[PDB]
Amino acid sequence: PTLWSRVTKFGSGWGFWVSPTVFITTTHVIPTSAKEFFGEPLTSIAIHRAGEFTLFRFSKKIRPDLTGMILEEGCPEGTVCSVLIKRDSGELLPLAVRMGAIASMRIQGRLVHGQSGMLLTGANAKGMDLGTIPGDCGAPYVYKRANDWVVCGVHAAATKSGNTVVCAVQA
Amino acid sequence: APPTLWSRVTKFGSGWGFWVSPTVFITTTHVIPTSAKEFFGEPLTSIAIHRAGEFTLFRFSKKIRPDLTGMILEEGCPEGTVCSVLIKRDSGELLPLAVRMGAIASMRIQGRLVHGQSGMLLTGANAKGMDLGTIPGDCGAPYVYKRANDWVVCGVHAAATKSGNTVVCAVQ
Numbered sequence: 151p152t153l154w155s156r157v158t159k160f161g162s163g164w165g166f167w168v169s170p171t172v173f174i175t176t177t178h179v180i181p182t183s184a185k186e187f188f189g190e191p192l193t194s195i196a197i198h199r200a201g202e203f204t205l206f207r208f209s210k211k212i213r214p215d216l217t218g219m220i221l222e223e224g225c226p227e228g229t230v231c232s233v234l235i236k237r238d239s240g241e242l243l244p245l246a247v248r249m250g251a252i253a254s255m256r257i258q259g260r261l262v263h264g265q266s267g268m269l270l271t272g273a274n275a276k277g278m279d280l281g282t283i284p285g286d287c288g289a290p291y292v293y294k295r296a297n298d299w300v301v302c303g304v305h306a307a308a309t310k311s312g313n314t315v316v317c318a319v320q321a
Numbered sequence: 322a323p324p325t326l327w328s329r330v331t332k333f334g335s336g337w338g339f340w341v342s343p344t345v346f347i348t349t350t351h352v353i354p355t356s357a358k359e360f361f362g363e364p365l366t367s368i369a370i371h372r373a374g375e376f377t378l379f380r381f382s383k384k385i386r387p388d389l390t391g392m393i394l395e396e397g398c399p400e401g402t403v404c405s406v407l408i409k410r411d412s413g414e415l416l417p418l419a420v421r422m423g424a425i426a427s428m429r430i431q432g433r434l435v436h437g438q439s440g441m442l443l444t445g446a447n448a449k450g451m452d453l454g455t456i457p458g459d460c461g462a463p464y465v466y467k468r469a470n471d472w473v474v475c476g477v478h479a480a481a482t483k484s485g486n487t488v489v490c491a492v493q
């Protein structure tokens with residue numbers, strides 16, 4: 151029974167099963183041409199979009215093996231989260247991120263709104279296993295609080311230098 | 322981490338070991354099956370064994386892994402080096418855990434006395450559990466890092482604190 155089984159390949163990135171019927175992802179990775187997802191017609195899926203955060207609610211249980219998890223709108227400033235990166239290589243890459251303020255920035259090309267954070271692997275990756283890449287968008291941000299895992303958003307962007315990351319949040 | 326490093330990580334005893342070269346295999350002393358008299362088809366009498374506390378090196382008299390090139394084994398690494406611990410988990414999942422390395426230390430962990438290079442995980446705030454931290458089955462997994470042009474191996478997983486935050490790499 152694992153958090154990691156909830157992280158699923160989707161579109162140009164990844165998404166995360168909060169419960170048997172709730173899936174969260176980054177808006178820009180979602181296929182723009184589709185009639186169905188996970189074998190359910192789009193007919194029967196509720197979509198809730200807020201900028202770079204998207205939540206799907208399915209009308210039947212897609213992942214009945216899972217319990218429902220706590221989903222919150224970001225986390226307190228100073229919280230050290232983990233970004234749960236999956237790679238097509240087969241690597242699982244949990245990276246520590248110090249979370250900061252809600253903000254807008256022009257991460258490389260474009261403007262992005264969400265909860266800013268700083269990677270805690272420091273120095274420099276030179277070596278993909280200490281930083282994010284474009285293909286990682288949709289990976290979830292999580293932390294342990296009391297006895298429970300909290301999910302507080304999804305990977306939307308990371309600066310050229312790789313240091314600053316943006317976690318898109320609900321509402 | 323490159324495929325050629327993952328190919329060197331071998332299930333062994335109650336944990337893992339790592340092929341440095343076609344003739345050299347390293348592991349954590351406590352994962353070795355203590356009754357064993359044969360390794361990779363070779364008798365004990367044909368293997369040179371070098372033991373320093375929780376670090377064990379086996380040198381064979383024939384090439385066991387001729388597919389491999391010999392790489393660099395160092396006695397730990399500079400303070401502040403970020404290593405990956407090359408951990409295999411249930412189902413062809415590969416978990417290269419990031420760790421910031423510190424001083425050579427003597428500690429008491431789960432009642433046992435352990436000596437090696439201390440480090441702190443860079444995976445999350447608390448790491449007590451299998452999702453972000455180590456488990457006892459991980460012992461013997463190698464500590465590797467990348468330089469300008471190559472990769473080095475600098476020790477094997479020996480222990481981790483109850484909190485999960487601190488780990489110990491046994492060194493040559």
Ligand SMILES: CCOc1ccc(CC(=O)O)cc1
Pocket residue numbers: 228230248268270
């Ligand atoms: C409880 C979290 O507190 C801190 C965590 C990380 C740093 C180091 C950094 O931000 O690079 C500083 C303070």
